[PDB]
C-alpha cells in the first residue's frame with residue numbers, strides 16, 4: 129500500500145464527468161473540475177485540463193495522468209504551507225499518507241479547520257487526535273472514508289485499507 133493505492137480506493141475511478149459527494153462536477157480519480165453548477169463550465173475545464181475536445185469523456189491514461197498531477201500538487205502544497213509542513217515533517221511514512229489524503233479531499237483551506245487535531249498529531253497523541261478528528265463536518269458527511277483515514281492516523285498501519 130502507498131498513497132496512490134490508498135486514494136484510488138477512497139475516490140474510485142470514473143471516466144465520464146460525475147458529481148461528487150458535495151454535488152460538484154468531477155472526473156477520474158477524484159479530480160474536481162469546478163464548483164459551478166454548469167455542466168458546460170465543467171466540460172470546458174475538462175477540456176482545458178486534458179488539452180483536447182473531450183465531450184466529457186476521458187481514457188484511463190488521461191485519468192491517471194491527472195491523478196499523478198493532483199498527488200504531486202497535494203504533497204507540494206503541504207510542503208509550502210507553514211502550518212502543514214511541520215506536521216508532515218514530524219510524521220512517519222504511513223501517517224504522512226493520511227495527511228496527504230485529507231489535503232487531496234479537502235484542500236489546504238478545508239484542513240484549516242483542523243488546528244487542534246494537527247497539534248495533537250504533531251505531539252503524537254494518537255488516541256486524542258482520533259477523537260478530535262471525528263468532531264468535524266468531514267467525519268459526519270463521509271463517515272466511512274473519515275474512519276479509514278482516522279484509523280490510519282491512530283494506528284500508523286494500513287489496516288483500515290487490507
Ligand SMILES: [Cl-]
Nearest residue numbers: 176177178197
Ligand atoms: Cl489541471
Ligand SMILES: [Cl-]
Nearest residue numbers: 270271272273
Ligand atoms: Cl465515506
